[PDB]
């Protein structure tokens, strides 16, 4: 039987690799926020707590579950079984309410801009996170650990490990409705209002200009510099014809409006000098002109102030990773209410693992797309 043994060795290697990636990625996120004040924002406070729950899953949950499935029974004991189940459900519930905190916090940012942002401090974020973990502990830990003493009998036999009050399939489905399906519905509606709020024009032009300027600086070939030059110039002219939030609400004849347009005119002049040199065969010189563009952009930036499009995308990525990795297990619970043989044990294990995988892919949804996280990662990994 060489194939069965190879399956066991393959599973141990894959599970150990998944656990290790989950641990390293989330420790990198947590340490980066703690050592970089530029990363110490309210958003990253929520992401810090989310990385903390993901780290616990990678350290405790994945390894204990791998030991459970590989050995074929629970080898540690009833106490360690109860602690593992309680830790798993408390951490998972804290994750769900953490995503609800991120979704509601973003909702009040886009719907109450005159009131909520001033109430959005680090102390408020810490209290919300602390309340989420305490509520999760109170909801799940006493029932999981002490239900056997409430009914006066432990029905979990030796070598088994499962939540005792989940012996009724309808109870498990009710848990799936209250703890997974309703929160997912709330976050979906909340995100729906988020993307509808983001769906004003001035930020959409200035963000395009800065983005294409970065693309010019870090371009690999001659096509990227051309496309970014043209699209930045189009966004530059659209941002030129419009009026910024100028002070004193001055007329177009004002010295503030005239010099505002003049800065964009000089910007287009350097843009066309860069485009010319790019067509002469001096594509490297067009990149040097982008630095001069950056200089001119910094010489007349006092007239302007939005990365919030990236923030909305980041939230959607975190929400989709949660929904997609946790939905299979929860539909197995739904089918389990009326057909237990319809879900084999191997399928249950896969659904359980996909939920764990949520913690593995979580850091890649926000950390691997943020310039400050990337630079802090590089600093943490470079030899001093
Ligand atoms: C560790 N898990 C893989 C176990 C199985 C799943 O359980 C759920 O999806 C239920 C809702 O059906 C759930 C329980 C608690 C908190 C959130 C969801 C995901 C998490 C949770 O701790 C359990």
UniProtKB/Swiss-Prot annotation:
Task performed by this protein: The muscarinic acetylcholine receptor mediates various cellular responses, including inhibition of adenylate cyclase, breakdown of phosphoinositides and modulation of potassium channels through the action of G proteins. Primary transducing effect is adenylate cyclase inhibition. Signaling promotes phospholipase C activity, leading to the release of inositol trisphosphate (IP3); this then triggers calcium ion release into the cytosol.
Protein name per its UniProtKB record: Muscarinic acetylcholine receptor M2
Taxonomy of the source species:
Eukaryota, Metazoa, Chordata, Craniata, Vertebrata
Organism field: Homo sapiens (Human)
Per the annotation, the residue ranges of the short sequence motif Important for signaling are 105-107, 362-366
Membrane topology designation: Multi-pass membrane protein
Give the record's PTM text. Answer: Phosphorylated in response to agonist treatment.
In the UniProt entry, the disease listed is: Major depressive disorder: A common psychiatric disorder. It is a complex trait characterized by one or more major depressive episodes without a history of manic, mixed, or hypomanic episodes. A major depressive episode is characterized by at least 2 weeks during which there is a new onset or clear worsening of either depressed mood or loss of interest or pleasure in nearly all activities.
Source organism, top-level taxon: Eukaryota
Quaternary structure (record): Interacts with ARRB1 and ARRB2. Interacts with RACK1; the interaction regulates CHRM2 internalization.
Location in or out of the cell = Cell membrane; Postsynaptic cell membrane
């Amino acid at each position: 039987s060489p194939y069965k043994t190879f399956e066991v060795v393959f599973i141990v290697l894959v599970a150990g690799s998944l656990s290790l990636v989950t641990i390293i990625g989330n420790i990198l996120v947590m340490v980066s926020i703690k050592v970089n004040r530029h990363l110490q924002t309210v958003n990253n406070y929520f992401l810090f707590s989310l990385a903390c729950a993901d780290l616990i899953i990678g350290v405790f949950s994945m390894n204990l579950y791998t030991l459970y499935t590989v050995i074929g029974y629970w080898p540690l004991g009833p106490v360690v079984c109860d602690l593992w189940l309680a830790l798993d459900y408390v951490v998972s519930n804290a994750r769900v309410m953490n995503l609800l905190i991120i979704s509601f916090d973003r909702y009040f940012c886009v719907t109450k801009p005159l009131t909520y942002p001033v109430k959005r401090t680090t102390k408020m974020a810490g209290m919300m996170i602390a309340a989420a973990w305490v509520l999760s502990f109170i909801l799940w830990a006493p029932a999981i650990l002490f239900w056997q003493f409430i009914v006066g009998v432990r029905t979990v036999e030796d070598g088994e490990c499962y939540i005792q009050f989940f012996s009724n399939a309808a109870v498990t489905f009710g848990t799936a409705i209250a703890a997974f399906y309703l929160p997912v519905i709330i976050m979906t509606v909340l995100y729906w209002h988020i993307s509808r709020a983001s769906k004003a024009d001035l930020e959409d032009n200035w963000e395009t200009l800065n983005d294409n300027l970065k693309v010019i600086e870090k371009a690999d070939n001659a096509a990227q510099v051309k496309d970014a030059l043209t699209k930045m110039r189009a966004a530059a002219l659209d941002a030129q014809k419009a009026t910024p939030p100028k002070l004193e609400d001055k007329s177009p004849d004002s010295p503030e409006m005239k010099d505002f347009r003049h800065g964009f005119d000089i910007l287009v002049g350097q843009i066309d000098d860069a485009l010319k040199l790019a067509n002469e065969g001096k594509v490297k010189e067009a990149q040097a002109a982008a630095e001069q563009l950056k200089t001119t952009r910094n010489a007349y930036i006092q007239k302007y102030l939005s990365r919030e499009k990236k923030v909305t995308r980041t939230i959607l990525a975190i929400l989709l990773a949660f929904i997609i990795t946790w939905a299979p297990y929860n539909v197995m619970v739904l089918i389990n209410t009326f057909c237990a043989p319809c879900i084999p044990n191997t399928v249950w294990t896969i659904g359980y693992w996909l939920c764990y995988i949520n913690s593995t892919i979580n850091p890649a949804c926000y950390a691997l797309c943020n310039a400050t996280f990337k630079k802090t990662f590089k600093h943490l990994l470079m030899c001093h």
